[PDB]
Design a protein around this ligand. Sequence first.
Ligand SMILES: [Mg+2]
Ligand SMILES: [Mg+2]
Ligand SMILES: [Mg+2]
Ligand SMILES: [Mg+2]
Ligand SMILES: [Mg+2]
Ligand SMILES: [Mg+2]
Ligand SMILES: [Mg+2]
Ligand SMILES: [Mg+2]
Ligand SMILES: [Mg+2]
Ligand SMILES: [Mg+2]
Ligand SMILES: [Mg+2]
Ligand SMILES: [Mg+2]
Ligand SMILES: [Mg+2]
Ligand SMILES: [Mg+2]
Ligand SMILES: [Mg+2]
Ligand SMILES: [Mg+2]
Ligand SMILES: [Mg+2]
Ligand SMILES: [Mg+2]
Ligand SMILES: [Mg+2]
Ligand SMILES: [Mg+2]
Ligand SMILES: [Mg+2]
Ligand SMILES: [Mg+2]
Ligand SMILES: [Mg+2]
Ligand SMILES: [Mg+2]
Ligand SMILES: [Mg+2]
Ligand SMILES: [Mg+2]
Ligand SMILES: [Mg+2]
Ligand SMILES: [Mg+2]
Ligand SMILES: [Mg+2]
Ligand SMILES: [Mg+2]
Ligand SMILES: [Mg+2]
Ligand SMILES: [Mg+2]
Ligand SMILES: [Mg+2]
Ligand SMILES: [Mg+2]
Ligand SMILES: [Mg+2]
Ligand SMILES: [Mg+2]
Lengths: 243, 46, 95, 217
Amino acid sequence: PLHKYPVWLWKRLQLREGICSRLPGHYLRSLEEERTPTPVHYRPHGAKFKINPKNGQRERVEDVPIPIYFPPESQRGLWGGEGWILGQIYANNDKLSKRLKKVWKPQLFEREFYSEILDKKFTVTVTMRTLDLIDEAYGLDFYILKASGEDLCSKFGMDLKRGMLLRLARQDPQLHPEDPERRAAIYDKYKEFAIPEEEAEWVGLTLEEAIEKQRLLEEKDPVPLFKIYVAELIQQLQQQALS
Amino acid sequence: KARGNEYQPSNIKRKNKHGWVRRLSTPAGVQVILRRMLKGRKSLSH
Amino acid sequence: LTYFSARKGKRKTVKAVIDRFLRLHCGLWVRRKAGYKKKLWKKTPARKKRLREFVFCNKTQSKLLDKMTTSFWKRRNWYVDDPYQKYHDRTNLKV
Amino acid sequence: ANFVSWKSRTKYTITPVKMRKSGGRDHTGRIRVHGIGGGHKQRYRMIDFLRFRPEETKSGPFEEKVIQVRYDPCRSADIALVAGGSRKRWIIATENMQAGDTILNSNHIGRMAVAAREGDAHPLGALPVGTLINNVESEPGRGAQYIRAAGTCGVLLRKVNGTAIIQLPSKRQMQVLETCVATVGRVSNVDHNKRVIGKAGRNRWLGKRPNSGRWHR
RNA sequence: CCUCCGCAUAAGCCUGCGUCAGAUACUGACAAUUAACAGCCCAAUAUCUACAAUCAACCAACAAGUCAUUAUUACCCUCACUGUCAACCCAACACAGGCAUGCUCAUAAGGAAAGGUUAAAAAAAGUAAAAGGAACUCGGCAAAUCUUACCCCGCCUGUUUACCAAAAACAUCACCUCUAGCAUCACCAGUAUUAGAGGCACCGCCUUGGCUCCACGAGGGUUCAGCUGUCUCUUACUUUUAACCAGUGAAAUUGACCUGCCCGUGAAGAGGCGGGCAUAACACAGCAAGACGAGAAGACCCUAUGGAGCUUUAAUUUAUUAAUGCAAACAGUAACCUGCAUUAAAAAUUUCGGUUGGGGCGACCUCGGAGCAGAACCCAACCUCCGAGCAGUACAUGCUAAGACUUCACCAGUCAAAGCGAACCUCAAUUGAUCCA
RNA sequence: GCUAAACCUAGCCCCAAACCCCCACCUUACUACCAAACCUUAGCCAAACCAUUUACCAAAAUAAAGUAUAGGCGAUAGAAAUUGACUGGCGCAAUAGAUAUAGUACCGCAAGGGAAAGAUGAAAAAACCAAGCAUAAUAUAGCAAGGACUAACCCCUAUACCUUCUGCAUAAUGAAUUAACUAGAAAUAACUUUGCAAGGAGAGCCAAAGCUAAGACCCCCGAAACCAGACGAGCUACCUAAGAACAGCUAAAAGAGCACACCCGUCUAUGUAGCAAAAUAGUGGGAAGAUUUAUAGGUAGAGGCGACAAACCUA
Ligand SMILES: [Mg+2]
Ligand SMILES: [Mg+2]
Ligand SMILES: [Mg+2]
Ligand SMILES: [Mg+2]
Ligand SMILES: [Mg+2]
Ligand SMILES: [Mg+2]
Ligand SMILES: [Mg+2]
Ligand SMILES: [Mg+2]
Ligand SMILES: [Mg+2]
Ligand SMILES: [Mg+2]
Ligand SMILES: [Mg+2]
Ligand SMILES: [Mg+2]
Ligand SMILES: [Mg+2]
Ligand SMILES: [Mg+2]
Ligand SMILES: [Mg+2]
Ligand SMILES: [Mg+2]
Ligand SMILES: [Mg+2]
Ligand SMILES: [Mg+2]
Ligand SMILES: [Mg+2]
Ligand SMILES: [Mg+2]
Ligand SMILES: [Mg+2]
Ligand SMILES: [Mg+2]
Ligand SMILES: [Mg+2]
Ligand SMILES: [Mg+2]
Ligand SMILES: [Mg+2]
Ligand SMILES: [Mg+2]
Ligand SMILES: [Mg+2]
Ligand SMILES: [Mg+2]
Ligand SMILES: [Mg+2]
Ligand SMILES: [Mg+2]
Ligand SMILES: [Mg+2]
Ligand SMILES: [Mg+2]
Ligand SMILES: [Mg+2]
Ligand SMILES: [Mg+2]
Ligand SMILES: [Mg+2]
Ligand SMILES: [Mg+2]
């Protein structure tokens, strides 16, 4: 026989029918969005059309991305969209020669970073691309608040994002009192990335964590039917006393 | 010599080598059980 | 030659044939002579001209190339300024 | 394999520990070293190699009394059970220390080279120049790893401002710091190398089987 | 009259000769192995344990060894659960095989070699044998009676191809050489008298050794002596088999068969074809000349642009490891990780043309002149002979274009009037496509 | 006249529609109760070898178009912009349709492989023929018949079939025989026949009589292999852990002598579809050790393991 729905659509059917349906709206919006990253290991065509050589006619060009591979150590740190390139290569830059496996890895550093919003010094495994993106973002706090989910590409990086975002959304006593003007300076410096707390709590989670957080919200130890029925009976007797 | 009898039974070896606990220890053994379950086997392990 | 592609189910052309031969619409195929621009210092002038001609193909060669291409290459093309537009049709060919 | 190494013991015990053979095999279960397996069953005597290890809440140079010189199955020398203070321990016995001798463990660097007997141990500052020593450590305090096999004696050739030069028994030279401890004298079981093994049986008791395919290539 | 049998535990089976009923140890029903034997254990923190065993006493070693608790804290509630049968398990089988430990040393336990005859052959096993005593034979193999010496090899005891090889091979003490100065998952809880790797073969004397050299061997040969059915040369009996009666009852094999001999013939070795001859029909027992008997899509030989190895000084690669160099990421002062190159190691992929009076060896592989092939064209050869892989002269050695030839296909090759432009090619083969560059 | 033979519905297949599912049990599963997932597929295969390359598989109608494009520029590969997208059956009917009466019985240590088969009828509270035989053995002579004949034989003629071969009666292959099942799949272009016709066609195409539609044409079984992922060390090789056995005599701690138990397997004989997919019987070698052996554990496939025999790793 045939399935009623295609198998690539089975996951969306789950996300519509389950507790995954009782997940909040914005979270499922992000999960369904799932956009494309920034070019890191390939050079994008600057144009949509190009007059290709060997015949002066404009052919359309699309830039296809390299299938990059990210290890769990990357997710433990922060690599700036940078990962391993597992591919083949030709032996002597000549196709009429051996074809042979190749793994290109990035260079990894243990750098120590201060985040002004959390006020903590983190030591993480960065690379030069993160360092440069931090320099062009003008700080780690701005880098993590500005960078998108998949351009950041770290479970840790998005934990940092929702910690920072919750810090902003609650306006917490972050360092301690006696410096509320400096705290006001911090939250005014990053005032632009302000979202509701009910959104910032769900920023950055995996789907497993989101389902676990949701069922923790809706546990609700059962109400005794003694309570329910005595409420009904009291209502009915007050109705009879009214009538 | 006479080479008929390679099967020298012991229930400790039988259970330790092909048992449910051992099948379920390895991820390839979990797939062995899953394959017997799909085939429909009445006995999935020793 | 790929009579049935895995992708479409259609029949494929041999692009080696399209690189080398010209199909005129009447069924004639026109080629170059194999060797027409090598060792011209040691070839004699008459052999050099014989090599320089564009020649026709045999009947069985024509049928093989008919088979090795698809019918896109057998349609009637009305290019702007074509040096073969007069050759695309047969005149006085009795039998 | 399920290879927990048998050497899990933490406290320095004087009693022998039941020693498990290995067959020359890794934790992976496969042969790593060829020609090993099936000796006589033995037990490991825990040797303290830090010759100057003063006992708990005590002071510098101390005295020990040798109790018993004994064959050790797990090495080539003889082990002396010695006792000093409230604790007793095994050490490698140099040659000609019987049961009843008294040995000295000093960390003191006397300016004059100490006139010392054959058994005791001092740093190389207290040892004279050109002196036969055996239990030698590279850094001070790590414990002796060099000459301590049966009948071997490395010489102290010269003393330099902060270091010293040891001729190791391979006709070798080694720079050691001045302050590290070393025992004087040559190790026991001399004549040991002039023991003919005799039978392939005697080799198989020592724990070395004939093994072929030694190059897994 | 028999038996390394029997009984028990272990392991393994899982009700598998208990009673009854029924049909032709099978089927069903009903029963049964009762814990005292055995199993299922331990509240811990710190800590204590140098001393073997062997009748363990002298005494003897080397290969150096298994049996062991204390101070305190908490803990009296007590005996559950499970195994317990048998003629049994692993070998497809009610299988001459495999099967650990205790005890009995011929059993106190357990079993039955003959269905019934007869007494042929051939076959199996046994016993006896005149005279002779290895004449047998590859060889004293087997039997019979016990023994001697010499060589060859390997020093020895050991190990090996489960299921054709037990050896001269492998291992082994001994010796040499090479690599390694060190700590915690091997080597190693080790340290140059140590560890890892390779090789030779003990030993006395001397410096690819050599000469002696003792003991040992189901090794390989040789001699003497005996002994004997090995033999001259076979025989007699007994047991199994056998044959016949009774019960049960296979398998390979098979185109169909109404299935003779001789000579000839013929895909060259005929029951069946030609010419002769023979010739009523059916069992049973033997035999082994034929059915190119059966078995197993010949392992020998060749073939396949079939497969797999094996080694390399075959081709292609270093993706992986290594040790360099260069950057990259730190400290500075007037090491480890990543990227790119290199040379090594281990590899990894892949292939190993053709003709051939089998294949291999040797020789050849394209083109041209002559002969075979005498008079249009053609015409083979691991047939008979001779040559070429260019050389000259100028550089019309331009450009075009009717019509033809063609090496037996195509590709390629050859001639050529006229016309335009001009001075006014020689040539026996004298060579090479496409894609790339 | 025995053995049989016959049968029809148990179900199944392809579509459409519609998105579907008390106790015990990860310890030795089915046992009341104690201190860690995430990493390019490779290769067979085509290139008539093979070494770059070699379709798709990793959701995408019709056409553009097998076009641009790629490519030992070769086998082959190949776009996009743009463009019109209510249940049924010329299905099976018990060797078929599902493997299915069942993932059972049985086989294997395991992963795994994997069957067979039933037909009285409304109610059972009721007939004939495959092969093989039998009824009924045979009578000279011969591919088993044919011509015939008064008549079965007698007479004359007469080298089974298939396949492979230059040539087979061949002493070349296959085949006891019966029943059932078991092997020609399609395009380019032609031709034939209609429709319409300088146009055809229910657009995206062709067209210097064409175009549209149909009809005709392309087998079955069989390696050794290769790669990936599992499963295996209850046999065997080696190792680890905690055990055990080794009479007697001689000898007096020796890889000691003779010799049982046990371990092995030298010679012969039997056996060969066997008692046995390596046994039996006598003969023999070791039998206090580099021994044998029970139990548990470990090493896993270009891997292990090896006192090297290409040995062993479940016949
Ligand atoms: Mg059997
Ligand atoms: Mg009795
Ligand atoms: Mg009888
Ligand atoms: Mg006689
Ligand atoms: Mg003779
Ligand atoms: Mg003779
Ligand atoms: Mg004999
Ligand atoms: Mg020997
Ligand atoms: Mg053998
Ligand atoms: Mg054996
Ligand atoms: Mg043998
Ligand atoms: Mg021997
Ligand atoms: Mg009978
Ligand atoms: Mg004849
Ligand atoms: Mg015949
Ligand atoms: Mg034959
Ligand atoms: Mg053959
Ligand atoms: Mg060929
Ligand atoms: Mg191949
Ligand atoms: Mg292979
Ligand atoms: Mg050849
Ligand atoms: Mg021609
Ligand atoms: Mg191929
Ligand atoms: Mg069926
Ligand atoms: Mg079936
Ligand atoms: Mg009949
Ligand atoms: Mg022939
Ligand atoms: Mg043949
Ligand atoms: Mg046959
Ligand atoms: Mg039939
Ligand atoms: Mg085992
Ligand atoms: Mg002995
Ligand atoms: Mg022999
Ligand atoms: Mg062995
Ligand atoms: Mg060999
Ligand atoms: Mg060999």
